[PDB]
Structures are given as C-alpha cells and as structure tokens.
C-alpha cells in the first residue's frame, strides 16, 4: 500500500504514534516520507547484508527476522515479511520498541537526516486528526 501523508498520519495516531516517547505526529510522517515514501512494501538492502523493511525501514539486523542476516537478532519477534503488510500495526509496534531504545528516532538515518530539526509540523499541515 503506498499511503497518502493524512491518510498515514491518521493510521499513526489511530496506532499511538503521536508523542510516543516525545515525538509528535509530524516526526513519524516526515521519517516514513523519507524511509519509504509511504510505501508499505519498501525493502532496502544495507551494505552490511541487512535489510530493511516497510513503511518505517525496520532493519533486520536486530529486529526481525529474515533469515538472512547472520548474527542478527529478531528483538520485536516477527518475520520481516509481517512489516510489508497494508496494515501498520506490525511496524508501529516494532517502532514503539525502536524508539525506546537510547537513541530515540536517531536510530532512522533519514529522520535524523532529513526530519530533526525541521518544522515537521508541516507534515500534518490540513490533516482532519
Ligand atoms: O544506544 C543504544 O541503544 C545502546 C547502547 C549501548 C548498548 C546497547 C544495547 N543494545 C545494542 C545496541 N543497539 C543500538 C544501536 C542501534 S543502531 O542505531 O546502531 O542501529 C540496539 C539494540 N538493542 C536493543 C535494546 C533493547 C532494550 C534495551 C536496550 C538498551 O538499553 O540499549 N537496547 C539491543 C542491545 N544499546
Ligand atoms: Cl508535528
Ligand atoms: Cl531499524
Ligand atoms: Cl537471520
Ligand atoms: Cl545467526
Ligand atoms: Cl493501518
Ligand atoms: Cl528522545
Ligand atoms: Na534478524
Ligand atoms: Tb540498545
Ligand atoms: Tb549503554
């Protein structure tokens, strides 16, 4: 499914994105924007062997599994395929997991990149939330 910016904006806050652990709605539009342009059923390999699956670009090397990425862990206990779903409960769950860990939304290279600092507000700008 590849979502429109209200549409997933909606389906995140539905989910109980919108400020988890600090975060407004906007910071988890903008990092999907860029992680996946809000295309559920994004994959990209990483140099390392890992990849990197869904809406949120979940990396296999220490959240799902994927049989395929030796040494990994599988930390939110579901397949890799389950984060490529139309359906985000899988990847906002896993996320919930992500961006509780030390480093917060750092751990997405293309929010810290492309979203920290931004008025990510403008991603929910006409949004009926
Ligand atoms: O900054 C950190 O998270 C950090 C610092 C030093 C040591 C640890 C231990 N991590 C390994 C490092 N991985 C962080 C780097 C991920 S990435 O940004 O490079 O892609 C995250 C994976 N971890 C998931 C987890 C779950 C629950 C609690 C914690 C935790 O207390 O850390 N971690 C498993 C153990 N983590
Ligand atoms: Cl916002
Ligand atoms: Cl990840
Ligand atoms: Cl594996
Ligand atoms: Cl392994
Ligand atoms: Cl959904
Ligand atoms: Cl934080
Ligand atoms: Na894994
Ligand atoms: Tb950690
Ligand atoms: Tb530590």
Same mark, same amino acid.
């Given at each position: 499914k590849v979502f429109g910016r209200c549409e997933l904006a909606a389906a995140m806050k539905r989910h109980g994105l919108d400020n988890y652990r600090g975060y407004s709605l906007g910071n988890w539009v903008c990092a999907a924007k860029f992680e996946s342009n809000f295309n559920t059923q994004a994959t990209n390999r990483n140099t390392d062997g890992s990849t990197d699956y869904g809406i949120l670009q979940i990396n296999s090397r220490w959240w799902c599994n994927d049989g395929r990425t030796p040494g990994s862990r599988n930390l939110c206990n %579901?397949?890799? #395929?389950? =984060? =490529? #779903? #139309?359906? %985000?409960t899988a990847s906002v769950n896993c996320a919930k997991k992500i961006v509780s860990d030390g480093n917060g939304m750092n751990a997405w290279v293309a929010w810290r990149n492309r979203c920290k600092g931004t008025d990510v507000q403008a991603w929910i700008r006409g949004c009926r939330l």
């Open positions: %579901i397949p890799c #395929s389950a =984060l =490529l #779903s #139309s359906d %985000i």
